[model samples]
Target: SVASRFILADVITSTAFSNASGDINTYASSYIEYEVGVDNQLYYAEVRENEPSSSSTFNNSWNGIYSSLKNARIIIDQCGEGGRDHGNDVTRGMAEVMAAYNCALIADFFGDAPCSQAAMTPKMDTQQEIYTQIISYLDDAIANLQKEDLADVTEQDFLYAGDADKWLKFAYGLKARYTMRLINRSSNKSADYEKVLDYVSKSFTSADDQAAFDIYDSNNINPFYGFYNSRAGFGASTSLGTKLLAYNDPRANRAFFTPIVDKKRSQVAANDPSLVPAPNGSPDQSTSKYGISAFVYAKTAPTLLMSYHELMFLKAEALCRLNRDAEDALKEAVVAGLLNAENSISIAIKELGSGLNTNSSEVITETSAGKYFDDVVKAKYAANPLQETMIQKYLAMWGASGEATETYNDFRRMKGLNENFITLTNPNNSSKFPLRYPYGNSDTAANPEVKAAYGNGDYVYSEPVWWAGGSR
Candidate 1:
């Protein structure tokens, strides 16, 4: 059970919100350059090159995820009647859910990867095959979680305190997320979206039930804070600022801080008049020349594995795809997204108030969020609901919640569906936009199949993932 809890922390901190040896910097640089902001010093990911397949830019994340999978596998293998601990259904079920999460992440990022069944010489499995296995893990988890004679894991579980019902909801939420990811492969798109809606209905009903890892403190700071505190490689985005300021977004004021020359620390002034963002692909390569994030690098920010607002956005998108009236869901998603961002900032102010000059007045209420939706979003929705909804989703996922990767997935899938709503400002996107990340160097060095697939390491810019209408 302790191993299972450690696996949770490892996967969330390393794979989901990694900062080890420039892993988070690289991945977050890609997301920031392509969708949100700019890397102040590192222009490689901004221009989408120098991913360094030989040395492995994402190797830390690759190892971290697989390591977590192995630990989870131990619990799934043992902790039953045949092993030392008997009838530990809840513990095993938790392991199964984590395994499914890891599997889905591998498939999403790398397209095809080695499965758990691989032995000494591992062979690559197709994304389709891996996704099938993901569903199997979730189904098994649901069954095992429903059974009686479950062992107590409350002392070890960091996510839910061994609340089986919450675990059940998380499984359904993963089901919904993965199901939506593969909608392009479905025979009937509308029917598959209905299944997504059903999964969301069984998933989180409110923010309290969301799978958020809020285990940070002064000593053990958040990954985003750790990265900024150590590296400071990132800065605010001019493109993202333009979009939000144009829309009159309420979160914009609290989102950025005026850059201080040589101070090397962010000043969280809610009403800083000069919000100078860095150029998308042509930044000044100095942190003092551009704005920085205020709340995103908070020491106590929660790493959200999945959020209630994300579930609402999924439901709203599904409803729109089904040609149903999705106004209510869209409105709810907007408000929830704002509230979630506000909650993070509020926590940051209370915890890290020594340097950051955060004002409690900048925080928002549901009523204010609803008014913004009614005044600013109603006509935009009328113009084109799907486009507007997706745009809002891109903005909502642009916080410290670690949902930027999900936004990247959303952008790729939308292009595959012949839809393009979000606009990127990086000039190199026309010729240098990376469709997928390169395979980890550790695997490419040891595995012949991966080595062959990673030949020249330029396929990342050319080939998309399977669900995004690519063969591999």
Candidate 2:
């Protein structure tokens, strides 16, 4: 019975990760960079028209993440204690750690959220204060885990089978993640970096140890399947331009599908022979199977809340920021992150290759399989195409909408951390960077405390969060 309850909590947590990841990916891959003048923001409705109030992504993300926090809090309060079995203390402990972990993510995204007061009341807190509380909560989680002997824990712990060592590594790894977020805080840089290094050193040593959810054939659908398969009415928008594509250093084929044909036009109009085009008129667009079809469907998988590869990247970032083996660590970690991404993409491709046949008769394959994989993964964009891995990982985590806020936050970090990072390339207006989300409509209306704290909309999308303090 305790095991069933734990499984329920795990599923809930995984769903949150999916929602957050998808929302974040949509922002990063489709909107943020475009809004910042690096690409076309018009791909997403809000940024395209340049309406400050058009923060649909932000609003959705805020609600999604907070809902996740609520679920996590409920589990911590109701299931973990003696509600099920006092002898199964490990389940209780694990639930607390997971709750703490989930809360840290909430703070990471929203800044100040309803911690301490969450689930018990309606009051909200500042993002800065929440961060401190998260640290303490994680510390307590680690301690609880240390005191528990989990050798008998099984079936319910989808991530680690109640292996305390893995949980310990996860707790530390999560700390490293939060520490890295504090890097831009000039006041906290040294201390945070030290913590980053310590926790990263103790994190998952291999991808196998990374925190991921296994997808089964029942109620728990893989988050990305709907979108990738075109069932969600989502498609690649023309918003991804040639220049931006070139900037990112994407795998050539992976970045874009090859045009059906190359053409050379001549000045002599009458005698000049032009290139043949696809059935559609776009000549530059790829006819090759590797090229993305005009919004064809595909599928994705459930993703990470805090992945082992991400821990490695955080370690690399910490070392790089601290000037401790900066080049090597960053590169190695970047590679590792990319490889991790590639592994997922490869898995998706394999699933696609199998043809989504529920009963086995409705399967199909095309010749462009290899090219499609290459283009999406390996194409070159003038900017950092590798960043897409971050985007894709977020996409895979579609159900965890709250974590998506982190993706939005990371967009700020990506630009701040890399001077050469792509800038928005919208043809119309100025304002090269995205603004933060306006405070949620509900918070603005119902919570006067939050409204007063934000001070007359001064903390709108234009205002940067505490961690995103850098000149753009």
Candidate 3:
């Protein structure tokens, strides 16, 4: 039983590092991950100085994502004659749910992916149709996991450990996620918002309730360590205190390396760049290195496919959009605020950041569980509630295992909304942002249909996905 569970979880971690073509860090996080994350930070204007190549490094997010999606299908199909009583509802339910997740991500990233046929006979389905399929698969997963007799693969469950209830929540949470992405296309914005509220209501109640993955195996290790920690002189943006650190977002001190309390400075002074070269910038700042944290890096710091913080942000956003009950306004913010404290800013510090400081108090405190909050969140929400929510959602996910790809999704989808919480500024470049990435060389070579789909412009700055439909 333990072996069975281990293998299933192994697929997930492998999927996490899923990659190819001279890329370890790129794929190690999500074959299709990290580079986009670094690029995402650049694109979203999260960093002024570290402007990611402006262009993109990897376009084959499809390859890793597609391969992993198929891999998930294998688990769902219960492959080979391998198992004993690992059979029954729960294990299989988890498999299907993960399959749904992979497929959903493919659809989100690529727009129309082949759903009916896996290969050459490609009949790509639009995201609209794919969302329907995703919801349907998740629904089935919910039903499968709900069966009364199911027993969990406790030790084996890297995400929820066969916890059927949590798995069910993952489905609903994801349902809300894909559903909310249609903010622009949703024929009925109000109703769709309500639907998201419903789904989120049924989802995670806390960070512990997240569909989080972890370093269950010591050998697996923290992926970020190999990426950023191993590298020297890698602080956040090139701009001193511009961009991400511009706002007093409490996340700056915890999530980035800079020389400002609450990031109140305009920029970190021309002479104040590079936290490297020591005391110059001194211990008076923050950084994003992980391996230096712990050989056992908060074994619990969330490396999630989805987390409660994400769900909470979704709920807060939905409620804000709906804004139905005038009297419930502050209460609503308060509730989401408390959840954000517990899951978003706070947890990243305790489970992850604390190892770096050892002072222990640097953790984001949930002080003012009420409103008019005077922290980073308050400033963002002050500017524009929805935009800041998206920003925090991005921050809440910082440096965690699945961050890059997920944040890339954040940057891409923000375009679909037209209005954005994040902006860009670059004098060294032509355009301020990238629209979408073209299919990778490998992807085009292998899948001609996908190649044909690259009709408009097969370049990084061209082809914004379907939802991101608009001219720049």
Candidate 4:
């Protein structure tokens, strides 16, 4: 029955967001911003030290995403035209979008993954083939979402409460993201920029329309919060703080949190430079001595599938690439990004209780955000708009919105294009910056082909994904 199907899909989607998204978030954080100096497994990720194929570093994400993909496949097959739901295009479209999302994650992180042979002793599919399939899924999602629906998943749909239009926007937003991801391989850069703009124009216009999973509460809790409380392995990043502190970004102070005398978090003082973030390459590996991220501690923070600011940044980047004026778009992106930080801080503050003292001036308003644009951003942008635009995007992705993966993708993409907009100060990066992650331990042990591909696992430091100018 439709009721049973919706119930099953609801559970599956919830697991995808809670488990799969959480695992990916922590994995990305380990390499990009967060310093996991305690646990050797995750510490290897932060410093790019001794991360072997047998290490369980990336297993959580690998297993979680593939599990989610399996669930999504079930929904797509069981709810589509010939299935028991009798042509429930809306639910099927939703499943397709999520499936495409999972596929893209595999393509970006690993370059080659099982696609067509996923059911059997899976054979590897090139990044190019995977992306083609991803686009096809997105197109199918767009078409099915636009078609008249046979049933509703309203009560079960947690993302947008069954609003098909919001799902459509999310699909379009992903199309833009994936399209931009492959820009280095594009035959016509200008045409691709135009295409990105078209996709963005049809995607989320504001934060209200973004695909955010906000179901977490005190009992369920956020994954970042869970990881920080339980493992306490990772701390804040000096490399990330340097970018914000250099520009006097408004979110700088609000982003890094410190435990007061009573164990309540207070914003780190703007002048307290040493305490804001742990040194990127070399740190004392103490979470308490260093800084804790305000965003990570927020119990109610939403897991953003795609943020509105990211879309705006994409649009701004495209415009700048085309030699068109992008100042307005850039301003919008910055403002949205700041407001997002404000929201995350508010959640953290609320969870940590009102007793904790927080600086009032740091709270972002439209006025203050615009002032930041006028005072700090404009001049830098005027001097070098493209670099500033990318740097701002990097800073904007620093919070707990689950955007670090996209930022990691951007860094590789920029490196491939010979663009050095955002610089990392980690000395080890010269020799050991991780270009990709090793295959999961389970696959290495179980699959012969995957184990052969995973030989010695040192290629992660040397090779980039195909989209990033490396052959798969």
- Top TM-score hit: 4
Model 3's lDDT to the true fold?
Answer: 0.51
TM-score of candidate 2 against the unseen true structure: 0.68
For candidate 1, the per-residue lDDT at 45 reads 66
Backbone clash count, each prediction separately: 0, 67, 11, 0
Which parts of model 2 are misplaced by more than 4 Å? 1-4, 7-18, 33-46, 50-61, 78-89, 149-153, 186-188, 216-220, 228-250, 255-300, 354-407, 414-422, 427-429, 451-459, 470-472
Q: Model 4 off-target regions past 4 Å?
A: 1-20, 34-40, 52-55, 259-265, 273-276
- C-alpha TM-score for every candidate: 0.92, 0.68, 0.72, 0.94
* lDDT by residue (tens digit), candidate 2, 172-211: 8878877766666657687788888888878888767776
For candidate 3, the clash count comes to 11
TM-score between candidate 4 and the true structure: 0.94
Off by over 4 Å in 3: 1-7, 17-61, 79-87, 119-121, 148-152, 216-218, 229-234, 238-246, 254-300, 324-361, 368-383, 427-432, 455-459, 470-472
Model 2 scores worst on lDDT over the 10 consecutive residues at 264-273
Clashes (candidate 4): 0
Model 1 CA deviation exceeding 4 Å by range? 1-29, 32-42, 52-55, 148-150, 261-273, 350-354, 357-361
Give the winner by TM-score: 2 or 4: 4
What lDDT does candidate 3 reach at residue 94?
Answer: 70
What do the candidate models score in CA lDDT, each in turn?
A: 0.73, 0.47, 0.51, 0.77
Give the candidate order by descending TM-score: 4, 1, 3, 2
